[PDB]
Each structure stands twice: as C-alpha cells, then as structure tokens.
Design a protein around this ligand. Structure first.
Ligand SMILES: *[C@@H]1O[C@H](CO)[C@@H](O[C@@H]2O[C@H](CO)[C@@H](O[C@@H]3O[C@H](CO[C@H]4O[C@H](CO)[C@@H](O)[C@H](O)[C@@H]4O)[C@@H](O)[C@H](O[C@H]4O[C@H](CO)[C@@H](O)[C@H](O)[C@@H]4O[C@H]4O[C@H](CO)[C@@H](O)[C@H](O)[C@@H]4O[C@H]4O[C@H](CO)[C@@H](O)[C@H](O)[C@@H]4O)[C@@H]3O)[C@H](O)[C@H]2NC(C)=O)[C@H](O)[C@H]1NC(C)=O
Ligand SMILES: *[C@@H]1O[C@H](CO[C@H]2O[C@@H](C)[C@@H](O)[C@@H](O)[C@@H]2O)[C@@H](O[C@@H]2O[C@H](CO)[C@@H](O[C@@H]3O[C@H](CO[C@H]4O[C@H](CO)[C@@H](O)[C@H](O)[C@@H]4O)[C@@H](O)[C@H](O[C@H]4O[C@H](CO)[C@@H](O)[C@H](O)[C@@H]4O)[C@@H]3O)[C@H](O)[C@H]2NC(C)=O)[C@H](O)[C@H]1NC(C)=O
Ligand SMILES: *[C@@H]1O[C@H](CO[C@H]2O[C@@H](C)[C@@H](O)[C@@H](O)[C@@H]2O)[C@@H](O[C@@H]2O[C@H](CO)[C@@H](O[C@@H]3O[C@H](CO[C@H]4O[C@H](CO)[C@@H](O)[C@H](O)[C@@H]4O)[C@@H](O)[C@H](O[C@H]4O[C@H](CO)[C@@H](O)[C@H](O)[C@@H]4O)[C@@H]3O)[C@H](O)[C@H]2NC(C)=O)[C@H](O)[C@H]1NC(C)=O
Ligand SMILES: *[C@@H]1O[C@H](CO)[C@@H](O[C@@H]2O[C@H](CO)[C@@H](O[C@@H]3O[C@H](CO[C@H]4O[C@H](CO)[C@@H](O)[C@H](O)[C@@H]4O)[C@@H](O)[C@H](O[C@H]4O[C@H](CO)[C@@H](O)[C@H](O)[C@@H]4O)[C@@H]3O)[C@H](O)[C@H]2NC(C)=O)[C@H](O)[C@H]1NC(C)=O
Ligand SMILES: *[C@H]1O[C@H](CO)[C@@H](O[C@@H]2O[C@H](CO)[C@@H](O[C@@H]3O[C@H](CO[C@H]4O[C@H](CO)[C@@H](O)[C@H](O)[C@@H]4O)[C@@H](O)[C@H](O)[C@@H]3O)[C@H](O)[C@H]2NC(C)=O)[C@H](O)[C@H]1NC(C)=O
Ligand SMILES: *[C@@H]1O[C@H](CO[C@H]2O[C@@H](C)[C@@H](O)[C@@H](O)[C@@H]2O)[C@@H](O[C@@H]2O[C@H](CO)[C@@H](O[C@@H]3O[C@H](CO)[C@@H](O)[C@H](O)[C@@H]3O)[C@H](O)[C@H]2NC(C)=O)[C@H](O)[C@H]1NC(C)=O
Ligand SMILES: *[C@H]1O[C@H](CO[C@H]2O[C@@H](C)[C@@H](O)[C@@H](O)[C@@H]2O)[C@@H](O[C@@H]2O[C@H](CO)[C@@H](O[C@@H]3O[C@H](CO)[C@@H](O)[C@H](O)[C@@H]3O)[C@H](O)[C@H]2NC(C)=O)[C@H](O)[C@H]1NC(C)=O
Ligand SMILES: *[C@H]1O[C@H](CO[C@H]2O[C@@H](C)[C@@H](O)[C@@H](O)[C@@H]2O)[C@@H](O[C@@H]2O[C@H](CO)[C@@H](O[C@@H]3O[C@H](CO)[C@@H](O)[C@H](O)[C@@H]3O)[C@H](O)[C@H]2NC(C)=O)[C@H](O)[C@H]1NC(C)=O
Ligand SMILES: *[C@H]1O[C@H](CO[C@H]2O[C@@H](C)[C@@H](O)[C@@H](O)[C@@H]2O)[C@@H](O[C@@H]2O[C@H](CO)[C@@H](O)[C@H](O)[C@H]2NC(C)=O)[C@H](O)[C@H]1NC(C)=O
Ligand SMILES: *[C@H]1O[C@H](CO[C@H]2O[C@@H](C)[C@@H](O)[C@@H](O)[C@@H]2O)[C@@H](O[C@@H]2O[C@H](CO)[C@@H](O)[C@H](O)[C@H]2NC(C)=O)[C@H](O)[C@H]1NC(C)=O
Ligand SMILES: *[C@H]1O[C@H](CO)[C@@H](O[C@@H]2O[C@H](CO)[C@@H](O)[C@H](O)[C@H]2NC(C)=O)[C@H](O)[C@H]1NC(C)=O
Ligand SMILES: *[C@@H]1O[C@H](CO)[C@@H](O)[C@H](O)[C@H]1NC(C)=O
Ligand SMILES: *[C@@H]1O[C@H](CO)[C@@H](O)[C@H](O)[C@H]1NC(C)=O
Length: 304
C-alpha cells in the first residue's frame, strides 16, 4: 500500500522546481477534484520510479474531505527538520482545509504559545525556511469587503523576532554590522507585499505594505529621524481567480459561503524563508502555503 522513503534533492531552479512545484500543482488537482460526473481519474506520484493513476468509483449526504489524498508523519521530538535516523510512523488522511482558515504570514492557532519566542527551523546551510513562535499578542480578523483587522504589539513583536534572529547567527568572522530588509522576488522585479487569507471558504487576496514598511538595523536612533502618523486595515480584493505570487500566473477554486462572512483568526505562527547567501543580504520572505498547515501540527508533511 504505502511504501515511502526518506530522500531529497536540492538545487538552484524554482521554475523547474520539483517537490514544491509538484506538491503545489498536484494539490489543486486533488482539490479541484470533488465535482461529480460518473468516474474520475487522479494521478498519485510522490517518488516511486513510476506513477499511480488513482480511479474513484461510484454512481451516475456526508463525505469526509479528500476524495483521494492523505497525510502522515515520522515521530520523536517536538520538531527540527532534516537529517534524521527516522523510525516509527503514523496514520492520517482527510483534507477539509478549504472550509477553515489560513494565511501566507502567520499560522493561526499556535498551541502552548510559550512566552519565549521560537524560530523552529528546517535548515540547509544557506537556502532554508523558518517558523517563528512568540507568546505575545497578535490578532487578525477579516471583514469580507476586502479589508482585514488586527490587535497586538506588532511593532514590538517584530522586534522580538528581530530581537530573536540575532542570537543564533553568532559571530561569523569579521567584526561586523547588521542591516535587515525584505523582498522575496526571483529572476525579476515586482515591488509589493501580498498575503492571502482563507477562513470559511473564500480565497481572499491582500495588498499589504504599511504592515510591511520596516527597514532593520543593529543599533538605531529616531530622535533626529522622521515621524509621521499611520494606521492600518487591509486592502484585500478576493481573487477567486488567483493572480499567483511567486509567479505572475493564475489559479482558482470553487468555494462555499454564508452570505455575510466576516473572517476571523488567531495569530501565532509567523513564518519566513530568510535569505543569507554569501555577500551582503539577510532576506526575509513570506511564501509558505497549505503543506505548512499540516507541517504546523506534525513536524513535516509527508503526503502520497
Ligand atoms: C474573533 O476573535 C477575535 C479575537 O482575536 C475577536 O477580536 C478581539 O476581541 C476583543 C473584544 O471583543 C478585542 O478587544 C478590543 O481590541 C481593540 C484592539 O485595538 C487595539 O489595537 C490596534 C493595533 O495596535 C489599534 O488599532 C487600536 O488603537 C487598539 O490599540 C481595542 O480597541 C479594545 O480594547 C481597548 O479599548 C477599550 C475601550 O477604550 C477598553 O475597554 C480596553 O481596556 C482596551 O483599552 C485599554 O487598555 C489598553 C491596553 O491595556 C490601553 O492601551 C488603552 O488605553 C486602555 O487603557 C484604559 O482603559 C482601561 C479600562 O478599560 C484601563 O485598564 C486603563 O487604566 C486605561 O484607562 C477592544 O476591546 C480584541 O482586541 C479583538 N482582537 C482584535 C482583532 O483586535 C473578534 O471579535 C471575534 N469575532 C467575533 C465573533 O466577534
Ligand atoms: C509521536 O511522538 C511525539 C513525541 O515523541 C514521542 O516519543 C516517544 C517516547 C513516545 O512514546 C511518546 O511518549 C512521545 O510522544 C508525540 O508528541 C506527544 O504526543 C502525546 C499524545 O500521544 C502528547 O501527550 C498529550 O499532551 C498533553 C500534554 O501533557 C503531557 O505532559 C504531561 C506531564 O508531562 C503528561 O501527563 C501527558 O501524558 C503528556 O505527556 C496531555 O495533556 C494529553 O493528555 C490527554 O490526552 C489523552 C489522549 O486522548 C487523554 O486520554 C487524557 O485523558 C488527556 O486528556 C496527552 O497525553 C505529548 O504532549 C506529546 N509530546 C511531545 C514530546 O511532543 C506525537 O503526538 C506522537 N505521534 C506522532 C505524530 O507520531
Ligand atoms: C483555533 O482555536 C481557537 C481557540 O482555541 C481553543 O479551543 C478550545 C476548544 C480549547 O482547546 C483551547 O485550548 C483553544 O485555545 C478558536 O478561536 C476562537 O474563534 C471563535 C469563533 O471562531 C471566537 O469565539 C468567540 O469568542 C469570544 C471571546 O471573547 C471573550 O473574551 C473577552 C476578553 O476578555 C471577553 O471580554 C468577552 O466577553 C468574551 O468572553 C466569546 O465570548 C464568544 O462566546 C460566546 O458566543 C458564542 C456564539 O454566540 C457561543 O458559542 C458562546 O457560548 C458564548 O455565548 C465566542 O465563542 C473566539 O474569540 C476565539 N478564541 C479565543 C482565543 O478567544 C478557533 O476556532 C480555532 N481556529 C483554528 C485555526 O482552527
Ligand atoms: C555590504 O555593503 C555595505 C554597503 O556598501 C557595506 O557597508 C559599508 O561599510 C563601510 C566600512 O568601511 C562603511 O564605511 C565607513 O563609514 C563610516 C560612516 O558611515 C557609517 O556610520 C555613520 C554613523 O555611525 C552612519 O551615519 C552611516 O550611515 C554609516 O553607517 C565612516 O565613519 C568610516 O570611517 C571610519 O572608519 C574607518 C575604517 O572603516 C577608520 O579607519 C577611520 O578612522 C574612520 O573613523 C567608514 O568610512 C560604509 O559607510 C558602508 N556603506 C554605506 C553605503 O554607507 C558593507 O561593508 C558590505 N558588507 C560586505 C560583507 O561586503
Ligand atoms: C532579497 O533582497 C535582496 C536585497 O534587496 C535582493 O538582492 C538584489 O537583487 C537586485 C535585483 O537583481 C539586484 O539589483 C541589481 O543591482 C545591480 C548592481 O549594481 C550595483 O553595483 C555597481 C558596482 O558597485 C554600482 O556601480 C551600482 O551603482 C550598484 O550599486 C545592477 O546592475 C542591476 O541593474 C540591478 O539593479 C541587487 O544586486 C541585489 N542586491 C544586493 C543586496 O546585492 C534579492 O533579489 C531578494 N531575493 C530574495 C532571495 O528574496
Ligand atoms: C493579550 O492577551 C492577554 C491574555 O489575556 C487573555 O487570555 C485568554 C486566555 C482569555 O482568558 C482572555 O479573557 C484574556 O484577556 C491579555 O493580557 C492580560 O490582560 C489581563 C486582564 O485582561 C491582565 O491582568 C492584569 O494585570 C495587571 C498588571 O499586572 C493588573 O493591574 C490587573 O489587576 C490584572 O492582574 C494581564 O496583565 C495581561 N497580561 C498578559 C498575559 O498579556 C490582554 O487582554 C491581551 N491584549 C489584547 C486585548 O490584545
Ligand atoms: C522541544 O521542546 C520540548 C518542550 O519542553 C519545553 O517546555 C517548557 C515547559 C520549558 O520547560 C522548556 O524548557 C522545554 O524545553 C522539550 O521537552 C522537554 O525536554 C526536557 C529535556 O530536553 C525533558 O526532560 C528530560 O527528561 C528525560 C526523561 O524523559 C531525561 O532523561 C532527560 O535528561 C531530561 O531531563 C522533558 O521531559 C520535556 N518536557 C516537555 C514539556 O515536553 C524538548 O526537549 C525540546 N526538544 C528540542 C531539543 O528542541
Ligand atoms: C535595506 O534597505 C535600506 C533602506 O531602504 C530604503 O531604500 C529602498 C530599498 C526602499 O525600501 C525604501 O523605502 C527604504 O527607505 C538600504 O539602504 C539604502 O538604500 C537606498 C536605496 O538604494 C540607497 O539610496 C541611494 O540614494 C542616493 C542619493 O544620492 C541615490 O542617488 C542612489 O541611487 C540610492 O538610491 C542608500 O545607499 C542606502 N542607505 C544606506 C543605509 O547607506 C539598504 O541598501 C538595504 N539593504 C539590503 C540588506 O539590501
Ligand atoms: C517570558 O520569559 C522571559 C525570559 O526570557 C529569558 O530566557 C530566555 C527566553 C532567553 O531569551 C533570555 O535571553 C531571557 O532573558 C521574560 O523576560 C524576562 O523579563 C523579566 C522581567 O521580570 C526579567 O527579569 C528578565 O531579564 C527576562 N528574562 C528572564 C531571565 O526571566 C518574559 O517577560 C517572560 N514572560 C512570560 C509571559 O512568561
Ligand atoms: C552556505 O554554504 C556554503 C557551502 O556549503 C557547501 O556544502 C557542501 C556540503 C556542498 O553542498 C557544497 O556544494 C557547498 O558549497 C558555505 O561555504 C563555505 O564557507 C565556509 C566558511 O568560510 C568554508 O568552510 C568553506 O570553504 C565554504 N565552502 C566550501 C565547502 O568550500 C557558505 O559560507 C554558507 N553561507 C552561510 C553564511 O550560511
Ligand atoms: C576588527 O574590528 C574590531 C572592532 O571591535 C576590533 O576588535 C578589537 O580587537 C582589538 C585587538 O586588535 C581588541 O583589543 C579590542 O577588544 C576589540 N575592540 C573592541 C574594544 O571592541 C579588531 O581590531 C579588528 N580586527 C583586526 C585587528 O583586523
Ligand atoms: C536516496 O534514496 C534512495 C532510494 O530511492 C537510496 O537508495 C539512496 O541511498 C538515497 N540517496 C541519497 C543518499 O540521497
Ligand atoms: C494505487 O492506488 C490505488 C487506489 O486508487 C490502489 O488500489 C493501488 O493498489 C495503487 N497502485 C499500486 C499497485 O501501488
């Protein structure tokens, strides 16, 4: 039945991307797949040296969630990432997710969101992903019109996060000075900070810049530096037809609704893909989609 492995390939290309790209594309294949004619054809590659073309039988009411897909994890400690000696393994399947909530920025419910911030991270010397987790307060409710609300110490929190990310990258070599900024492009230049949010089915897009207007430095001053007064909401505009971030492309999905849905969600799990490759850059990024959801609970998604 299930006969996985534990191998991975990491390289240079993101358009010719593999695990990621494959995981993403296939997902909307499984997902777009819930509409009924009589008999459907599903694939089923995840790394076997050949492929499975899954075939659902039926006719020509309550159903779980993935007409054809399932997940499972290893086991042992709270979390790390990769280079395991992996052993015991568990059982799981359903995928109702579309129903519930989500975001490109901060994973929702966090659980024993201990005061002391976290940077829980799957490492790769240079090209890697993070998961920051602090107790402090953050809220994020959406109001359907296309504008999202908050509550918390978000300036300060980032500080912690920025206070956080300083302790583990220790003295590299030379006597140095820090200078954090963000982007997240690839091969081309945009110049905007988008985030998405799922909560109750509608797949809503947000133009998020005021939230993301901060240049970081080691030791600073703002006495003689400048001051203007700014406040915040979210100029979201649903894009059922999804305008794709990491690539100026397109996708869609077929949702439900409760007329006046006015989103809501608890913040905890702020994410990032920090870039620090040899030279002059500490490059925070915000791509970390649906497999992070389950990755959020287990340690690391395994699908098939
Ligand atoms: C879905 O779930 C979510 C949960 O996430 C629900 O949303 C949450 O629910 C709470 C209550 O419904 C809500 O509380 C409210 O929060 C507001 C947050 O706004 C603040 O943050 C943002 C970002 O920084 C800013 O835009 C804004 O300026 C605010 O700072 C607050 O506006 C409200 O609380 C405060 O105001 C009222 C009225 O004045 C006070 O009663 C209350 O005490 C708060 O203010 C005092 O305390 C703060 C901090 O201690 C001080 O800064 C402030 O000056 C006040 O200090 C005075 O007053 C108190 C006495 O009251 C006294 O201690 C002190 O001596 C001073 O005199 C507001 O009540 C959560 O924040 C909210 N989350 C979100 C999204 O913000 C949501 O409803 C759910 N959906 C459904 C189903 O409804
Ligand atoms: C695989 O492993 C993960 C961690 O590695 C495991 O390593 C080996 C040695 C195993 O044999 C495990 O001991 C260890 O789990 C698992 O994470 C763990 O998952 C368990 C659930 O099976 C968690 O326990 C739960 O957490 C609550 C926290 O309390 C814990 O601490 C106190 C005091 O130390 C203890 O009393 C508890 O037993 C916990 O250890 C706890 O409140 C929960 O109890 C409730 O739930 C049961 C079940 O329904 C219910 O009957 C009872 O009445 C309670 O209401 C519960 O015990 C544990 O926290 C967690 N620990 C770690 C280190 O992550 C992982 O789940 C497991 N599964 C997978 C994914 O493979
Ligand atoms: C993630 O989980 C979140 C909470 O998780 C908890 O789940 C339970 C089962 C436990 O396991 C906990 O360990 C765990 O933390 C969920 O977030 C919640 O979202 C819901 C709606 O989606 C919100 O519901 C409403 O909450 C009100 C809270 O405000 C109160 O607090 C203030 C602060 O002082 C008080 O002033 C207020 O008076 C409030 O008391 C609450 O009052 C509401 O309850 C009333 O109304 C409802 C409906 O009419 C009714 O059911 C209830 O009996 C009362 O009449 C209301 O329920 C909620 O704000 C929010 N929880 C938190 C953290 O506050 C979330 O669903 C889940 N999401 C994901 C990612 O899965
Ligand atoms: C990646 O790229 C960045 C940007 O190019 C490099 O940063 C530069 O670092 C050099 C180091 O020599 C800087 O040169 C120094 O500038 C000082 C003043 O500017 C700084 O300090 C003030 C106040 O603190 C700030 O207002 C300002 O913004 C700057 O932060 C000078 O005072 C220095 O002269 C003194 O030091 C020299 C030794 O360097 C002594 O011998 C002298 O006695 C003298 O007292 C010096 O000139 C330069 O300013 C930076 N660039 C920019 C754009 O400002 C990184 O080095 C680079 N990193 C890597 C890994 O390559
Ligand atoms: C994350 O953020 C990083 C920093 O913001 C991004 O790196 C930057 O990527 C842009 C896009 O390609 C590059 O911009 C180019 O700059 C070159 C270099 O010209 C400079 O050097 C010469 C020689 O000293 C000097 O004469 C000039 O005046 C310039 O100072 C230009 O030739 C190009 O036209 C183009 O503008 C940067 O090179 C690069 N910045 C850094 C830090 O080096 C990164 O793209 C982001 N990506 C991720 C991973 O999220
Ligand atoms: C940020 O969250 C905390 C947590 O409080 C909430 O916790 C959940 C589980 C729920 O029970 C909800 O009802 C709670 O509000 C809130 O911060 C704390 O707020 C309390 C009072 O609401 C404070 O207690 C007071 O402390 C002061 C100073 O020590 C005393 O003067 C008072 O007598 C009283 O003891 C406490 O200090 C706050 N500390 C924490 C844990 O952050 C807060 O409401 C919330 N902020 C918002 C609105 O975003
Ligand atoms: C991942 O985190 C867990 C969570 O523990 C944190 O919990 C809070 C409350 C705080 O105390 C913080 O210090 C904890 O790290 C870690 O789980 C705990 O780990 C300790 C030691 O790492 C365990 O004690 C051990 O007990 C065994 C017997 O089982 C001894 O043989 C060992 O020598 C040691 O003394 C403790 O049981 C764990 N408790 C909890 C709450 O899970 C975990 O270690 C950490 N993993 C890593 C390394 O990232
Ligand atoms: C991290 O960001 C800082 C500051 O960012 C500012 O500039 C851009 C990137 C934008 O985000 C804006 O909103 C920010 O306030 C970078 O430091 C400064 O970068 C600017 C932009 O190139 C430089 O300005 C220069 O100004 C002269 C004026 O004569 C022009 O002629 C030049 O063309 C040029 O634009 C300036 O060199 C930088 N200031 C410092 C600190 O010396 C920083 O480069 C960036 N670092 C990383 C990690 O990428
Ligand atoms: C949560 O705990 C921190 C303690 O954090 C300390 O231990 C590690 C997390 C490490 O990062 C270390 O650098 C850090 O100091 C509390 O911060 C504390 O604030 C108190 C104020 O009473 C000070 O006495 C301490 O300097 C400081 N740390 C210590 C050692 O306690 C934080 O406020 C606390 N909050 C909650 C809700 O638990
Ligand atoms: C990010 O990683 C690079 C290189 O890491 C090497 O790891 C090997 C397993 C293999 O994948 C090889 O292709 C890859 O280049 C780091 O470069 C190293 O820098 C240190 C410090 O000077 C030196 O010990 C090495 O000479 C040098 N590379 C080698 C192995 O020759 C790079 O510094 C690191 N960057 C950061 C800041 O994380
Ligand atoms: C690199 O610059 C650092 C800046 O700190 C210098 O570090 C000093 O090293 C000297 C010895 O040369 C020590 O006595 C001091 O304690 C350090 N400075 C202080 C007070 O922080 C160092 O000089 C530079 N490295 C060299 C020699 O190239
Ligand atoms: C990758 O996994 C294969 C099984 O497909 C295994 O034989 C091999 O050791 C692994 N190669 C490495 C080390 O990446
Ligand atoms: C592929 O999955 C189907 C379920 O549709 C299962 O019956 C079949 O055994 C699998 N193919 C093989 C031989 O791995």
């Amino acid at each position: 039945h299930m006969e996985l492995a534990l191998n991975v390939t990491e390289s240079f290309d993101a358009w010719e991307n593999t695990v990621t790209e494959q995981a993403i594309e296939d997902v909307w294949q499984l997902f777009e797949t819930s509409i009924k004619p009589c008999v459907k054809l599903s694939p089923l590659c995840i790394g076997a040296g050949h492929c499975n073309t899954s075939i659902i039988q039926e006719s020509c009411f309550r159903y779980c969630a993935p007409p054809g897909y399932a997940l499972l994890r290893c086991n042992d400690t709270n979390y790390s990432g990769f280079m395991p000696k992996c052993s015991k393994v568990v059982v799981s399947s359903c995928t109702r997710m579309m129903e519930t909530q989500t975001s490109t920025w901060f994973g929702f419910n966090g659980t024993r969101a201990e005061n002391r911030t976290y940077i829980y991270w799957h490492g790769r010397d240079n090209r890697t992903i993070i998961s920051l987790n602090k107790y402090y307060n953050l809220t994020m409710k959406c109001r359907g019109a296309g504008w999202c609300w908050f509550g918390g110490n978000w300036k300060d929190a980032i500080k912690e996060m920025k206070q956080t990310i300083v302790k583990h990258p220790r003295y590299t070599g030379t006597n140095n000075t820090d200078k954090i900024n963000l982007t997240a492009p690839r091969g081309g230049d945009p110049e905007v900070t988008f985030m998405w949010t799922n909560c109750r089915g509608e797949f809503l897009y947000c133009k998020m810049n005021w939230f993301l207007n901060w240049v970081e430095d080691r030791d600073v001053t703002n006495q003689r530096p400048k001051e203007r007064h700014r406040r915040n909401y979210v100029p979201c505009h649903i894009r059922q037809i999804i305008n794709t971030w990491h690539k100026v492309g397109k996708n869609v999905y077929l949702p439900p609704r409760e007329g006046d849905l006015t989103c809501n969600s608890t913040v905890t799990s702020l994410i990032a893909n920090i870039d620090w490759t040899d030279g002059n850059q500490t490059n925070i990024t915000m791509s970390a989609e649906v497999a992070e959801l389950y990755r959020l609970e287990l340690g690391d998604y395994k699908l098939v």
